[PDB]
Amino acid sequence: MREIVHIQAGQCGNQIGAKFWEVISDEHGIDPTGSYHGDSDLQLERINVYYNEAAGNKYVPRAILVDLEPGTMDSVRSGPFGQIFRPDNFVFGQSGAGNNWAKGHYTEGAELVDSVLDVVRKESESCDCLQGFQLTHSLGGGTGSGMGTLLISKIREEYPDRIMNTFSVVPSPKVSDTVVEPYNATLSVHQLVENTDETYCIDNEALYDICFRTLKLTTPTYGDLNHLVSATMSGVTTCLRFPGQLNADLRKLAVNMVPFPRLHFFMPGFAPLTSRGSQQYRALTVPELTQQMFDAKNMMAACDPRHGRYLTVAAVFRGRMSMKEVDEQMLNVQNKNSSYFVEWIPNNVKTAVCDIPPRGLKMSATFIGNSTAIQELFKRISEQFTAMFRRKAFLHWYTGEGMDEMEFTEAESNMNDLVSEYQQYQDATA
Amino acid sequence: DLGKKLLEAARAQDDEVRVLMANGADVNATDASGLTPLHLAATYGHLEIVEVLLKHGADVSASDLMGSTPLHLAALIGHLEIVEVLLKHGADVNAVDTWGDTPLRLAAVMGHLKIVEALLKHGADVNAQDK
Amino acid sequence: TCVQVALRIRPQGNREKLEGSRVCTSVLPNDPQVTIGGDRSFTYDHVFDMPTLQYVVYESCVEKLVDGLFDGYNATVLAYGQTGSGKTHTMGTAFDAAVQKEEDLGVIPRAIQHTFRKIAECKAQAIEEPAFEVSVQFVELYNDDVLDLLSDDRSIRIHEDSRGEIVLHGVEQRSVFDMHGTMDILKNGALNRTVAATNMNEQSSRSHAIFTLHLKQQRVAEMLCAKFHFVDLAGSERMKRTGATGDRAKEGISINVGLLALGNVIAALGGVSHVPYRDSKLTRLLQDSLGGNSRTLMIACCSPSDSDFVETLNTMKYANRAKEIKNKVVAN
Amino acid sequence: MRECISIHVGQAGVQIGNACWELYCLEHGIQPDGQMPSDKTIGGGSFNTFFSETGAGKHVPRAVFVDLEPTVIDEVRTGTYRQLFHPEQLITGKEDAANNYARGHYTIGKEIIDLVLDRIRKLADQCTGLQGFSVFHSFGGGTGSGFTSLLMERLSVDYGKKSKLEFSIYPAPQVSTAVVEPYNSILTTHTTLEHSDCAFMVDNEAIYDICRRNLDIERPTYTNLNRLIGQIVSSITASLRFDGALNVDLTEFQTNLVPYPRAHFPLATYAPVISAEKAYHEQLSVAEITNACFEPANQMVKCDPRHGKYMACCLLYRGDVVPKDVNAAIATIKTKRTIQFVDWCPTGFKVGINYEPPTVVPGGDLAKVQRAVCMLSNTTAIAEAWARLDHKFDLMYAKRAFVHWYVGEGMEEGEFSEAREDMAALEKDYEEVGV
Ligand SMILES: Nc1nc2c(ncn2[C@@H]2O[C@H](COP(=O)(O)OP(=O)(O)OP(=O)(O)O)[C@@H](O)[C@H]2O)c(=O)[nH]1
Ligand SMILES: Nc1ncnc2c1ncn2[C@@H]1O[C@H](COP(=O)(O)OP(=O)(O)NP(=O)(O)O)[C@@H](O)[C@H]1O
Ligand SMILES: Nc1nc2c(ncn2[C@@H]2O[C@H](COP(=O)(O)OP(=O)(O)O)[C@@H](O)[C@H]2O)c(=O)[nH]1
Ligand SMILES: [Mg+2]
Ligand SMILES: [Mg+2]
């Protein structure tokens, strides 16, 4: 299947999603003007997955840009690559969503969708072969969580037989201390469970702790969190963007990764962890790109992978190395640590490889796991949700907006079930 | 009933709060929840009205029907100012609602680190997790 | 406190006979066991062989359940098996414009008349009549949408109750007063069930239908509510035998996906810590039928022929384990 | 002359058939454009039945290459061999079977199965006699497993009279592209069983290890395995191209190798595997390369033939092989080695010899040897490999892991439990002929 349509919604989504477009444009050799100036034929070979061609050998991404507020799409036009994006695929309104799921899902934005959809339809009738869609959105509340989980639903009945995946940033106290945030995650996670084929769990709590206790950056900006994010959306998509054999398309990756239909949530992982300061420590140990990915402290989700079992892992080493120490030492991680991979899924760890790394790095790995450790993520948002719910705290921002208390109770049943399903398979046997 | 309307002024209206009390409206009125006006003002952030109510006879430790004190609620939402004012007027830190929690844990779970410090000064407990 | 399974074998059909198919199933006279293809054997609570008429089915296993309604005890009767094995005919969720009734009337219809007789049978007394409110709702799950069969359609939602039970919001729940009118809503609902033809059945069910009967009673020492679900499942299909294509075959896939999710739910309850109810909307709608707070009969339907062998094996293999399933019942 | 048609299905099928026709062309001095030097034409009596002659002396393989995605056959359409094959023979779709057996057999396959049939019709309507089809596919691929079984069902109702030989890949984790390959392998085996007459399975691990110590390739690519695999296929199809004594017809494969209908999975063993690296190498006598045919390191499926009973042997020699010395080596396996046969079956060792010098790829890793051999034992010990595969299958099916991808793609759940029980019966089939 060839070509992927990317949509970015919300403030967060539009910001990471533009860093995404920025980074992979470097890897591929498209400059802000859309002309190719790269030093490989390997870069142009599968360029059509994320870019369209045009008059003059120009390459304009397949992104829709979506926001209920303009203030995030006026500043991206004013960024390095806001020139290249097509102008008709900027779909802002003005209302805003007050960091409310209901306001994005039902009130405001329910009027801006069916405008987003009409350009979604547009870029997709140009497709020889559609893989599906990727959304960059935030789970923390507002135009990205509520419109985002409305786009995803309305896109599913129109293209039911296409793959839906998301990069879904997960809210933490430690980053935004916005009281109303555990509500809008449990409202989004309810919809992601029903309607996505795979979700990456970029968890702002994890990104905070890496930027503060690993990178030692005492006051973390949205730039330093996003840096760690864009390095991850390069790894987890590289298999889609360069020629290769393993997890090469959205559907093949889903079929390698999702054992049970509902457990389609992955925690990423990245080695080597870097800051924007641009100090590059490398060869400080080389085969142990295998012990770094598999470490808690390199995950992008606040989960200790040792507190459960892996179900499907996908390691992707980028750079210039030996495909033969990669093999040996990835077979070692699985046989030092044999209990941490479920047994009723034999050969559950697949290992791809790439020959071009990102800029900055001579060698870099990337990690895509379906671990049951992930339940620390949801149990965290479960407890913070149930705290705010039990006291009916702030519940009238939503009932006011043509919602209902049962959505709240329902959305908490779903994710709590998710938790115990992950916990059955974290403990199964024979 | 004026008490109902003072309850709705505390959720929202600092002017209309002292105009409704000088008409003889119950400081310690309750809704069906059991929430008094000092409750509804310490959740939703209003510092002035929180103190106004306290200079005129509010039970700083009144629980609702699920055992919620004014500082339980004030810790949950943030509102460190309202937590301190509530503490100097004799508020119970080590008090427990019908769910088993304490205003400490409500402030841990939600990440209001500024407040968990203050809470721990005037009294902690051993129900919660070590952190 | 535990799920009843009953298995019911149909007579060979005209295709089967005229095509050379032959009997491999074997039940003994007045015996709750069955034997298939010689070797492999199973016992149930009931086994009704190929000439068992409709009223024999009702009395032996369903008469008790309808009673228990008046005793505030919920019940379930779901038919489960392969396409063309007699699910819809057994349940009584289908009606032919020109046959006539002609007796031969399924579970749901006979269940109506039972209800409306024990109501007046109770109303007769010297100590003053108990008042009853009988209502009905009637949905189909067609390609992962809950459609309402009681209305002029085009949505609906599935949520958990206050006691934790599964309630359908946005489904018409209209009230009924005697046999003749409860019956006429059953016919006009069946008129809306999505049905079309496959090579395995000229009237193949393209959805799962649930006829839920509600009976809130008020009497002297109290108030006794009890729901009763009548699930007429779509049968599992194989694309090579149905001949399905397009809109047809898509229906057959989403049927199979939900019967998959019913499979694992049967296995987890018996066969442990989790039970995959949320894999399908079908298995959410059945979450109290199999979980608990229903009294549940499974009527498992089987072709007798050997042209439907491995299929009847599967049906039997799940039916057998389903006996092991603990329903936990309380009066409402 | 009676013709054979090659169908190559799915990625492995296509890239192995590409390596096969490469070696075929070299073996009859045909060029990558179809043309042949008149130096190598004969007076009629050109026993290429795998090749079709046209006017202007182009030789066009009797082959159909089929993939549900376009990338791999695209690399046949613009490579060295864009000239050899007619484009009609090269059929692609756009969406693959995302490593899903059910996509290939039930949904994405049913949308391209008619066009394949009717193109493969054009190769057949141009044959005067016809024996059937040599079909190349993979057990773990989606199209390999799933579409192949759909083609066999239908090449068996059309051409019901015709013989069906398959060369089948058996997956190894060292080159696994996917986790459901055990699902895919037991699925394609159950549905194809009743439609194949003989099936030589190629364990990607067996080949991978042979490439690792005999050719000393450390991390082998598909291009190493295919070179080596392209060899053993040519030893099989030597007779069908060189008017030989043994296996003259496709039926005689079934005649010699497979007595019982379901137990039709022989064990190919090959020698010598000699690296082009070695500077000087004393070529290996018939007696040497025949004793290597009983060394388990050289077979193409991992199992212990010693733990199992033989029920048919054929040995196929190639090059400078004198027939007297063949029988000295054969009579001495019967004494230097203990090789038990089925309680009820003739003991013998058919022999063929080909007298043509083994060809290897020029500038490849295999070294041109002087007398090679390829034995095709049919052992009960190959049941060992079906057990490996069955157990991996069992581990996941216990949990219904991944099944929901198959049922959502055309399948009924019971098909899984059914296909798995054909196997339970087959492991019992190998249990009863021997011991
Ligand atoms: N020897 C050899 N094995 C291969 C080759 N290509 C793939 N394989 C094996 O084939 C299996 C995967 O099957 P594929 O052929 O790639 O799948 P497919 O037939 O293209 O069908 P799709 O899943 O639809 O893409 C794996 O076990 C690989 O080990 C090849 O060129 N040579
Ligand atoms: N015991 C029986 N005696 C007589 N006719 C029967 C019996 N069981 C089934 N039939 C007939 O068999 C045919 C198919 O039965 P049906 O009740 O529609 O089965 P089904 O499982 O619901 N098929 P499907 O809806 O696609 O799963 C109809 O013509 C019925 O009248
Ligand atoms: N990592 C990261 N998180 C962000 C960014 N912008 C907002 N967030 C987070 O997203 C949540 C707020 O959601 P936001 O995207 O602003 O809501 P929206 O504009 O309605 O979609 C909070 O948890 C923030 O911590 C960003 O650029 N990077
Ligand atoms: Mg039916
Ligand atoms: Mg392929």
Numbering used by the authors:
A (entry chain B): 1 to 430
B (entry chain C): 1 to 12, 14 to 132
C (entry chain E): 4 to 102, 104 to 132, 137 to 162, 167 to 233, 251 to 300, 305 to 365
D (entry chain A): 1 to 45, 48 to 437
Copied sentences from the primary study:
KLP-12 forms an ATP conformation in which switches I and II take the closed conformation to hydrolyze ATP, and the neck linker docks to the motor core. In the nucleotide-binding pocket of KLP-12, the density corresponding to AMP-PNP was found with the Mg2+ ion. The other interface Lys269 in L11, which is conserved among KIF21 subfamily and KIF4 subfamily but not in KIF7 subfamily, makes a salt-bridge with Glu155 in H4 of α-tubulin. Two arginine residues, Arg311 and Arg317, in α5 of KLP-12 form ionic interactions with Glu410 in H12 of β-tubulin. Intriguingly, KLP-12 induces intermediate curvature of the tubulin dimer, with the α- and β-tubulin angles being 4.6 degrees more curved than KIF5B.
Kinesin superfamily proteins are microtubule-based molecular motors driven by the energy of ATP hydrolysis. Among them, the kinesin-4 family is a unique motor that inhibits microtubule dynamics. Here, we report that KLP-12, a C. elegans kinesin-4 ortholog of KIF21A and KIF21B, is essential for proper length control of C. elegans axons, and its motor domain represses microtubule polymerization in vitro.
